[PDB]
A paper describes a structure:
Central to the purine metabolic pathway is inosine-5′-monophosphate dehydrogenase ([name]; EC 1.1.1.205), a rate-limiting enzyme catalyzing the NAD+-dependent oxidation of inosine-5′-monophosphate (IMP) to xanthosine 5′-monophosphate (XMP). Most of the IMPDHs share a conserved two-domain architecture consisting of a catalytic domain and a smaller regulatory cystathionine β-synthase (CBS) domain (also known as the Bateman module). The CBS domain serves as an allosteric regulatory module responding to the binding of nucleotide effectors. The enzyme is inhibited by both GTP and (p)ppGpp, which bind to the regulatory CBS domains and, via interactions with basic residues in hinge regions, lock the catalytic core domains in a compressed conformation.
Surprisingly, in our study, the addition of ATP under cryo-EM conditions failed to induce the extended conformation of the MsmIMPDH octamers. The datasets of MsmIMPDH apo and ATP-bound states were homogeneous, yielding only one major 3D class. While the CBS domains in the apo form were not resolved at all, the CBS domains in the ATP-bound form established a defined position with respect to the catalytic core. The apo MsmIMPDH showed a notably increased deuterium uptake in the region of the flap loop, the C-terminus, and the CBS domain relative to the other parts of the protein. The highly dynamic nature of these regions correlates with the drop we observed in the local resolution of the same regions and the absence of the CBS domain in the cryo-EM map in the apo form. We demonstrate that in the apo form of MsmIMPDH, the flap and finger loops, which are constituents of the active site of the catalytic domains, form a packed tetramer–tetramer interface, which brings the two tetramers close together. Thus, the two tetramers adopt predominantly a compressed inactive octameric conformation, that reduces the affinity for substrate IMP.
Numbering used by the authors:
A (entry chain F), B (entry chain E), C (entry chain G), D (entry chain H), E (entry chain A): 12 to 109, 223 to 406, 427 to 440, 448 to 495
Write the structure that this text describes.
């Protein structure tokens, strides 16, 4: 009767959490070559990206330059909200205003580049969202550290009722089936997934709170797939294999954070120090209560090489799993590996 | 028929022991912000602390200054016993004798700072305990390396019969359900949990004896919660998130040991050597036969910063789990992580 | 109802994969000494080797010299295909053209040294295979990074129909029971097993695809043993005991890759740099789309010492397990070890 | 139906092997103080040692000096057999010929120190054994790397029939229940347990053969306890906690190897090199076919300190587990720990 | 005819420069114990200290607290000039306003603590100097990276005219006999010596300019001693013996810079980072063209320990050389040591 791990409640330790390093993609029957594989995926219920990648809403990752360069690559960028409302609307306008050079460009019905913008929760967040919709934005991301909150669901529902006909609303980070179901019910066109996905992330060390990303994606997909809501895996990625694992676990799009922090298209002036290069950037807008920043970059080259490497890894995984589309890749199986398979 | 780990007795390997690094706190539906979360918790059945932290009864950790500081920070200190009875009684009196500076101060009916003292087993222990009770102590920790002993149980019963109306008697270190049940039947007002909780501690290396702390807390709480007896988790803490994990496992209070040894309020002279700072302290009282000393410090800044960081991590965990109170956090669920989740 | 690792599909995580370091060979009742143990084993259904070792079809590993040495040591070499068809046919002829020095030599009906050659898929692959068959090759390895493909299966069937009477056709790398079953139904005379078997190999990092080698061997042998088709374990070997583990898991032969790259008989000029020795080698033929090269040596002494050490370890394992033959060793039992057993 | 680790045979991976680091001793009800605990144990069915330790039959560990010093400590030493028959008999005579200084001395019925001698298998081994029995030895150890052999059982039975009335015969190293049962049936008065117990021992790396020591002791005890045959754990020990774990797993005596290799009482001349000290020793007798030596010391101080430390660890473990005797210690339970509990 | 170092001009390489590590003080006939040695020495022609130590005018070294502590230690402080004039005057007033605690205190005619203030060159420097004189400063240091300049000389002359009767005008950094003679002719009451004195200082690396401190002190003293003008050695110090070497080389007082930067009395908030302590300080006034800043801190305990160590080393040197007074030490001899005397 007593639980082998202690106590009498078998649900106290609810589950065993698997991360990216715990699982591998099992090869399956394949008639797919990497070059012809279709990597297109649903970012929202109405928006299909040519590349299933989205740069994150970080002040070190996505601005108007990064958003434009990402849209021309076939993905999309989400403008961070650590800047004034007028400045964010101006960067939205910069992306919107700005043939063979960029064949994969993701464009709206007017031929203008698609762009996303992040919003918090509150009246300031509401006026920011209305300004960004007035500025011609296409996707509104109600992004927070812990989106299983009444305020976040209320904001998502308010946006979906007010500006839902024109733009698509995305709910912030979740890690459980219940949170994803709540976001789906509130009317989110997409659900962003991941709470403390990194092994030694500040959330795990300081708060003792976390959820391994593979299991979180599996639960959120179980919640969201019946209603057709796409799932965007955000965090815990270290190599191009992790993107393939996240998409095969059920997610529709991957959100790139620290992998794009130091690129040329990322914001910041490039400077030279001690034989190497870094980025320099010479709060009020940091209103997320559970954010990592409350609890407590080296130059990385052009965005094109990083995107090419990640897409090549994705295509190789699709070839190994025999997936002609991302939808078929979401049906791939996993094999769990032991600690002996982790040792270098 | 044979056990998969060897032999024919299925109880030879009683259970699988979880430590702090084995588990993470899952996010849940939350309407709680870390700032307004209440961290009040029971130390004993009668005493409540506004901050669930207690300093360990170690010579390097807790003297009158550390006890006073810990009581002023919202917790409590337990004065060590590696010293003559007169000195310990004088330290108790010093703490007892010594409104906008310390709002969270723990107090007794007379408004004086709450304090605790450790006692052993025996005649010298009995006279020490009686003198401490006369001196005005509030908690007597009958502390041993192994409290599942007839002598310790009899001492707990004798102190409960003699001074149970004045002071609260806390039983020493146990690691199983049966030992905690024995201490509860002995009349203890709280149970201190942990026996070789550290990974490579001396008790595990020299004697081969220990118990992982999460499982030990779960078993002790299974023994104590039906009777309302609080559990004090002692040992194994490395980060602020470990406090949240221990509280969620069922412990009501966490005892702070190695984390407080080098702080300013800890006893010892602060000296400067080789560009660093250390503490100096320029046996007849180490009478415990199973004590770690029988089997065989750097400066760490103010106590206030350590307490503030620990409480910030705990409040972040409460905001993540949707726990308005410590009792709600004790009902939070764990996710067990693999080895891959521990990789830096 | 939910899977303990996430979601609702119990087959999403298909199985737990064991690598070589996960298992050890249990001792058993033995009357066999290592010296008189017989290490003869089937390479294919028709070809038997006196030493169950084969050199990998890699440019850095196997050319005419390495093939000749491997055949003289009791095993066989497989000539790589990263070169024009004329060069590979000439190397096959060189091996074929070239009694107390080499008693264990593997031979054909005419007494010449047995040799193998790798072929791809396609028209150039077909003409390469036909020219190699004319040149006198004995084994054609239809080698790909992913043999669970219609093209590879059709190539195997075509080669079996065309040159099945003269040469033996070995299907390339598979990692599951279903792929091995498909290759067996395609008519393959042996199945090569392993897809990203290394812990941190490029296939696992860039593509997220792989399979632990012990489990992959077990599944492939479950597919092949009822039909008598031998399994060649390829990749993941680090020690001589790994050969014994792979053989006991059901593989009949182990292919030697990275262990043979730096040896004297391996191709390349032996040069001296910085007080050490290395090998030098002063693409149109790397046509495999899923090859490791698309996703992105030190000197090691004579081959004879490496082979002698490997065979000594294997013979010691056979003496420990009471295995007079390789077929008996394939029935040996494993003990699974924890992480603590891997600690240096 | 298919096995989750691969294949269709559920007994292919027979068991999960636990080592010393995998388990800890759970504290139990205790009325035992370390100083009064009885550490006496059965070395054989007729020989009870005052200290449950036996120095190993290694050329770097036990000679006449080490055997005498061990017998005076309350244990016993086993003379190694890597020396001439006449020399081993002479060292037996040296031990036999050579009040308050050594109260714990283990003596025969004549008051002479007890000593053990190792023998191989064969006619040379038989004449050596007869010489050693003629020399007044008390224990004959038929010691081999893999004692589950017809020759070893035949030698044990021959010795038990010929000289069984005077001396006690011990069977060599086993790791399974079947081997221990075979040794018991053949007539062994004690069974030595352990085959490749070390994590990175040569047997595991080279041969891929091994058995974690805790599970091996459990199985061998399950085989030997009903008939009253003592089990001697040999190998895998690194600290005094491991001796307690081995005895609590069911073994009656521990065999000390590398822990005593560099002591003063160990053979060899003490020399000074480069600011430290080592031992110097300025084959025909190495006839064990499966021995570690076939597959491929720093000074450690006085024996008394090492024996005192190991015995103190044992007594502390007995106090924690509440064992008044070694027989009661053999009833202690284990708790299994995860990888997170191994990290320093 | 040619110079052995190149060319035809023997004055191109003027002289060989000796640093502190090049020389050692030779023992001499002595009847002086360190305790009774007198360390009183001239700072300027009019002001005598009891300990010949002065804190440098750096914004990380000397503010009001450091100046007060230095004056109470028997020396004097020189306030940095990197701040508005009013703030520097306020610091001077704070020092001047602020009996057994500080027996060595340096005082003025009115019994207030002595203090110094740094001034630059120019009109703003003129008004700063006048305001500082009004505030009650005792020494004005006309400090520059290169004092052999007509502007610095004219500033010294103007200050010696206007406020020479009241304050002592100390000329800034020189490194040759000619510059020291120019400062003496300008009317400087003391001469500060050192220009790129450190081995790998920024002045030596970026500009290639410098002068070893022992030789520079010797030349400056050759210029100044015939006129009774004291020399302040400023830079190059690493150990307490360097102070004695500088004094014996002819300097009357040593200026303490980097050695006092991290002390408690130095300006800056003491912060705790990564288990250590550092200092924090949460340009228009850096108007010196040749200053080190134009060419391009850890905690150190109390000031008293550093002063005590330096004075103990100096007293030991005085006892070794037979120097009852600092002026006698200025007559001590040196032995030049080779590179072999520097090897650790």
């Amino acid at each position: 009767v007593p639980v082998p791990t202690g106590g009498d409640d078998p649900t106290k330790v609810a589950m065993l959490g698997l991360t990216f390093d715990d699982v591998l993609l099992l090869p399956a029957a394949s008639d797919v070559v990497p070059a012809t594989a279709d990597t297109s995926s649903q970012l929202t219920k109405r928006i299909r990206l040519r590349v299933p990648l989205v740069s994150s809403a970080m002040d070190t990752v996505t601005e108007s330059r990064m958003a434009i360069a990402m849209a021309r690559a076939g993905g999309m960028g989400v403008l961070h909200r650590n800047l004034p409302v007028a400045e964010q609307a101006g960067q939205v306008e910069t992306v919107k205003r700005s043939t063979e050079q960029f064949p994969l460009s993701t464009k709206d019905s007017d031929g203008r580049l698609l762009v996303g913008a992040a919003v918090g929760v509150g009246d300031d967040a509401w006026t920011r969202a209305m300004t960004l919709v007035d500025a011609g934005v296409d996707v509104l991301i109600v992004d927070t550290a812990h989106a299983h909150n009444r305020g976040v669901l209320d904001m998502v529902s308010r946006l979906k009722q007010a500006v839902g006909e024109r733009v698509d609303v995305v709910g912030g980070n979740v890690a459980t089936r219940a949170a994803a179901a709540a976001l789906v019910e509130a009317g989110a066109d997409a659900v962003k997934v991941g709470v403390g996905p990194g092994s030694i992330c500040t959330t795990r060390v300081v708060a003792g709170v976390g959820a391994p990303q593979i299991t979180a994606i599996l639960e959120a997909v179980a919640a969201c797939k019946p209603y057709g809501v796409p799932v965007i895996a955000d965090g815990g990625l270290q190599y191009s294999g992790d993107i393939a694992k996240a998409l095969a676990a059920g997610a529709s799009t991957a959100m790139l954070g620290s992998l794009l922090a130091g690129t040329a298209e990322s914001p910041g002036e490039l400077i030279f120090v001690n034989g190497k290069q870094f980025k320099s950037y010479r709060r009020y807008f940091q209103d997320d209560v559970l954010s990592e920043d409350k609890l407590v970059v080296p130059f990385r080259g052009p965005l094109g090489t990083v995107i090419h490497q990640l897409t090549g890894g994705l295509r190789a995984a699709m070839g190994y799993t025999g997936s002609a589309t991302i939808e078929q890749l979401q049906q791939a199986q996993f094999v769990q590996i032991t600690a002996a398979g982790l040792k270098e």
